[PDB]
Design a protein around this nucleic acid. Structure first.
Lengths: 81, 157, 129, 76, 215, 31, 205
RNA sequence: ACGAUCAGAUACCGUCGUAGUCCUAACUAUAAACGAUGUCAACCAAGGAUUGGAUGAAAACCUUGUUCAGAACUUAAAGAGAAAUCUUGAGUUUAUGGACUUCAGGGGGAGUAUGGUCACAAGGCUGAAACUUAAAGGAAU
RNA sequence: AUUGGAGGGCAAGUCUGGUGCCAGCAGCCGCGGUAAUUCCAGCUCCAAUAGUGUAUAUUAAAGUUGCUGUGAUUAAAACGCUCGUAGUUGAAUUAAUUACUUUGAAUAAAAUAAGGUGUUUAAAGCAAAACAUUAUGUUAAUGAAUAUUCAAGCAUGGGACAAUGC
RNA sequence: UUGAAAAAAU
């Protein structure tokens, strides 16, 4: 095949992840049931290296977590875009 | 200008005079074809470079361009009779993928070898230069005859 | 002073995308800047935009989605003949399959692939990867 | 910024979102030209040139706009 | 043999097959023996053997710095540097760093998607120090139009057609190869139009087999 | 700033703080 | 869905957090922590939103629980400040997560040749200001980090930040106590409808 | 001009002292005249403090919040660069084009010769060539 | 079958005699003061080849003349600073010319690219021949449309970006 | 308080 692989896409910046990027992470948030016990199913978030080193990863993720429903009111309404 | 009859150069010298990676590659073919000197390699390289430049220029235009259809077929047609390009490859992209072994393998010294008349490729020169060989109806003694497809089965003593 | 409003807007958009911002703001908004974005929107390089009227050539808010690499203006808009296209494409665009030029022709503000189809030339506005 | 000095003041009147002589005042040039007694004042002898260069720009414009008569010329 | 890393453990028992499986998830290669397992038959090239010196009270303490470029011709390459008191040790030391510095090379086509890949996909520029190297995609017939120093490296990376334009002090070879390797190293970070698609949900090998390596 | 906020719909308090000409639609502070 | 109804903070948990003045932060406010701050106190100190503290607390515990539910040793909990040494040590006891007690030797995530070289997949730090070294080494091993950040700390190389007081003895012990209990609840090894046997005083320094 | 020190001292060291140092009038027009950083415009991470207004609270001066303009400072895992370093740019540059003006082309010869012009003068401005030579130089170890 | 070369640039000798910072070699770095891989020699082999070095000049290299495209804190290089004419550059907006752009018209050949054509191939030339096994016919045979060609000039389709006053 | 100088090529 022409491509060597399909590179990951950062969930925060919607930009590619380098093969030499050793600051990028991968946060897995398992789904929880009505009882409140984790499940083998999970959703994967990827954050680029340069995002972390600025102080933005924590706030950027809260935008994604709140959108996906893992948080309820952490991020105010006027800060969601 | 002074003279009316045109003249042209059949080859160009390499830009870097001294490379070991080039002396072996060029001497690989000299033994493989019994060529007199390094002029033959450059001439064949010069010949190919002209065709590659036509296809390279022509690939930048649209397929519905009048010049692409006319000139494009003309280059493929010319190659087909010469037999450098296989018939089943009938696109201008395949012209750029040609190599320097395609042109040298249609020379008379090469053709008389694989057909079996000449035992050794050095022996082919004497037979060719001695007018022992004949192409259809005309005697030939230039070992550089780029035979066409039609004249392929018409090479006899 | 602000000689070229288009240059200021494109340089503002490029800076925001490098920082990974979600949206940008362009203070003086013209018809040419609005029409330049439609070429970028039709290629899905930017989500959309909102021209907010302020009675003073109002601002613009542009939504970006992680796709634009660089959009740049070209200083004085050179008259580009149709035979001078691939000379300009071979300079300003990274590859034959990726980039996109922008020309202001008599048939509006078109890109290179549809000004060629429309068979027209014109002054060159800018480009975007 | 300002026309002559490197100051950058952005104070402006703000007309709301609802729609429901200066050349004469720049002749200041008379007041400085005070200079007859303070002959050594190399400052006011410079700020006068700045004022006079402004007048030659408003006259140059009011003539093009066909406001001032074509024979106008500022002088002492 | 007997690796000391989590990823290195997976490779030895044949759990990670392809090298690019490492490259997708950004897992750092910390053992050179891993590369020799998933990339057999790596061709070898030695670029230069330059000697540095350090002035001391007694005299000069000379060490030999060796640049080696490694990589198979299928889109993988790496460059390593090592300085030591002996020539044999310098090449062996640079051997290891070259393998640990493997990087995938993205290549595409010039104008038509007729297999197979020959040239770089877009325009790339690598910035070492004063030396800057720019790679331009080229048609099929054109070889590697470049200086003898990056042409040796570009052969190993498996790029057959390319157009190069160089700026800076190219007579220093250390930066010339590093700037070449820096150009290729970022070939996969340039998000073109065809890479817009997010892609399917995959799993890191260090997470798929996390329970397995725990014992 | 680095913590990005919505631009199209500014908060009620935020437009009160900013400079009169730097609001989304410049309005005076007089009556 | 994603945040079911069994996840409100029960009145017991809120009662102790105000008692341990968890919501009470420092004076200088980092820009990245303005969202968690609700209002400024009477002597110009930040007061964290208790709900925002809990929502981030559970979310951090959920991430740890998933990673630590099959490989407990793949979680590392570092704690530099002498105050948080005991609580970090009990967190290790009840979950199996490795926990570096005192000083963090630089290169313990990068130097494989080291005898004490650990390669985790998640890192929990007690204080980003004191444990900046551990956070910086993550940026070399692609390992996400979780911090008990305060209103003044720098949020560089932290992905999940729990806004809580990380200087007082009570809050340090309490928050680690809640994180351990929440993790066990997600694991299913501790029912949500019962009371945890171990009291907070065990975690206290 | 003397007295010291010194091999010598026409110098640093000490003592005396003309022009000069001050003001007025007319010239001169050069400085390591420096931020060795042209003018104008757009964007641009985090933080504390300060000079002058405006605006709320706190009973002109002080304490606090917003905002405008000015001289500055600190941090960066980021951007640039050869590096020192720069960040209110020296960033947004081989992914090269916002507008305009001036200046430079290896080191000497040389800001020299000649021509022109300005000044009472010293001098300023414009300003080469023959010839000579593989280096001269910048930042850091 | 010669020319030039055998330290590096740059392919080719850790071969043997003299000279002893001398003769000399050397485009640049440099080699020679008694054990020269470079001098003058002998043998060996490297490159090109009926060609091969030198000297001068043009082009590329040279992103070391910058439109594409340079540099100006410290390497060469921001006028001491402000005003200023010519020149260059100029915010948003409207449901008679010029400039711009598209088609042509017209436009010496040779030359360039190029179509055909086996001068034994090639440079060449625009000749000829598949063939009628040829007088007959293909044949009234081919002649490249040969494309262009910059700056102006003529006409025409379009009015976005620009310019000139009412 | 006094302290000047050290031939050329390796």
């Amino acid at each position: 095949k022409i491509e060597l692989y399909i590179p990951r896409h950062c969930s925060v910046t919607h930009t590619l992840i380098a093969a030499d990027d050793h600051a990028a992470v991968q946060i897995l948030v398992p789904h929880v049931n009505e009882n409140g016990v984790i499940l083998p199913e999970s959703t994967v978030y990827t954050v680029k290296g340069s995002v972390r080193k600025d102080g933005i990863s924590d706030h950027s993720l809260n935008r994604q977590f709140q959108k996906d429903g893992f948080l309820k009111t952490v991020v105010p309404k006027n800060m969601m875009i | 200008g002074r003279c009316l009859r045109n003249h042209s150069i059949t080859y160009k010298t390499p830009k870097v005079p001294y490379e070991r990676e080039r002396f072996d590659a060029e001497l690989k073919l000299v033994g493989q074809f019994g060529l007199k000197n390094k002029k033959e390699i450059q001439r064949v390289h010069y010949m190919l470079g002209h065709m590659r430049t036509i296809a390279k220029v022509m690939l930048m235009k649209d397929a519905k361009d009048p010049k692409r259809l006319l000139e494009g077929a003309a280059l493929l047609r010319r190659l087909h009779n010469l037999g450098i390009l296989p018939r089943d490859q009938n696109k201008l992209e395949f012209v750029l993928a040609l190599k320097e072994e395609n042109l040298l393998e249609r020379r008379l010294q090469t053709l008389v070898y694989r057909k079996g008349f000449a035992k050794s490729i050095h022996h082919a020169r004497v037979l060719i230069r001695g007018k022992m060989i004949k192409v259809g109806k005309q005697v030939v003694d230039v070992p550089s005859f780029l035979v066409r497809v039609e004249s392929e089965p018409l090479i006899q003593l | 002073v602000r000689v070229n409003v288009l240059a200021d807007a494109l340089k503002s958009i490029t800076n925001a995308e490098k920082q990974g911002k979600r949206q940008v703001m362009i203070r003086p908004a013209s018809k040419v800047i609005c029409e330049f974005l439609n070429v970028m929107m039709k290629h899905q390089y930017i989500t959309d935009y909102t021209v907010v009227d302020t009675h003073r050539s109002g601002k613009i808010v542009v939504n970006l989605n992680g796709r634009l690499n660089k959009c740049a203006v070209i200083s004085p808009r050179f008259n580009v003949t149709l035979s001078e296209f691939d000379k300009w494409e071979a300079n300003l665009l990274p590859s034959r399959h990726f980039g996109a030029l922008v020309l202001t022709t008599s048939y509006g503000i078109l890109d290179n692939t549809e000004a060629r189809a429309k068979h027209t030339g014109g002054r060159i506005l800018g480009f975007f990867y | 910024g300002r026309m002559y000095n490197p100051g950058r003041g952005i104070s402006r009147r703000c007309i709301p979102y609802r729609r429901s002589e200066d050349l004469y005042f720049l002749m200041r040039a008379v007041s400085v030209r005070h200079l007859e007694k303070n002959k050594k004042d190399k400052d006011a002898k410079y700020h006068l040139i700045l004022i006079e260069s402004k007048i030659h720009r408003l006259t140059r414009y009011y003539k093009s706009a066909k406001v001032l008569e074509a024979s106008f010329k500022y002088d002492a | 043999w007997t690796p000391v890393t989590k990823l290195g453990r997976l490779v030895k028992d044949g759990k990670v097959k392809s090298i690019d499986q490492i490259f997708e998830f950004g897992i750092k290669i910390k053992e050179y023996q891993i590369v020799d397992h998933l990339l057999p038959g790596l061709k070898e090239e030695v670029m230069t053997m330059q000697s540095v010196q350090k002035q001391t009270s007694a005299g000069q303490r000379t060490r030999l710095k060796a640049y080696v470029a490694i990589g198979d011709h299928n889109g993988h390459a790496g460059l390593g540097v090592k300085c030591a008191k002996e020539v044999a040790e310098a090449i062996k030391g640079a051997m290891i760093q070259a393998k640990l510095a493997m990087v995938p090379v993205r290549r595409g086509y010039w104008g038509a998607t007729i297999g197979e890949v020959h040239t770089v996909p877009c325009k790339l520029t690598g910035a070492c120090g004063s030396v800057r190297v720019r790679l331009v995609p080229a048609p099929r017939g054109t070889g590697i139009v470049a200086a003898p120093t990056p042409k040796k490296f570009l052969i190993l990376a498996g790029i057959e057609d390319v157009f190069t334009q160089t700026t800076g002090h190219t007579k220093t070879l250390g930066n010339f190869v590093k700037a070449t390797y820096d150009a290729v190293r970022q070939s996969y970070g340039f998000q073109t139009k065809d890479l817009w698609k997010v892609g399917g949900v995959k799993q890191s090998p260090m997470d798929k087999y996390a329970k397995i390596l725990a014992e | 700033p680095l913590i990005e906020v919505d631009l199209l719909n500014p908060t009620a308090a935020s437009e009160a703080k900013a400079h009169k000409m730097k609001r989304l639609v410049p309005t005076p502070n007089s009556y | 869905t994603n945040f079911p109804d069994i996840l409100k903070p029960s009145a017991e948990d809120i009662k102790m957090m105000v008692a341990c003045r968890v919501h009470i932060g420092a004076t200088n406010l980092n820009f990245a922590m303005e969202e968690y701050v609700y209002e400024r106190g009477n002597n110009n100190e930040c007061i964290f939103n208790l709900m925002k503290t809990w929502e981030k607390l559970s979310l951090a515990a959920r991430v740890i629980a998933g990673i630590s539910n099959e490989t407990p040793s793949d979680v590392v909990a570092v704690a530099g400040r002498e105050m948080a040494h005991r609580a970090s040590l009990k967190f290790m006891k009840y979950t199996g997560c490795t926990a570096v007690a005192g000083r963090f030797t630089p290169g313990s995530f990068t130097n494989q040749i080291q005898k004490k070289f650990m390669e985790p997949r998640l890192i929990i730090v007690s204080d980003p200001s004191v444990d900046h070294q551990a956070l910086r080494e993550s940026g070399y091993i692609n390992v996400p980090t979780i911090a008990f950040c305060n209103s003044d700390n720098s949020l560089k190389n932290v992905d999940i930040a729990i806004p809580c007081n990380n200087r007082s003895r009570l809050s340090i012990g309490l928050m680690w106590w809640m994180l351990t209990r929440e993790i066990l609840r997600y694991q299913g090894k501790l029912a949500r409808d019962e009371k945890w046997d171990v009291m907070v005083d065990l975690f206290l320094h």
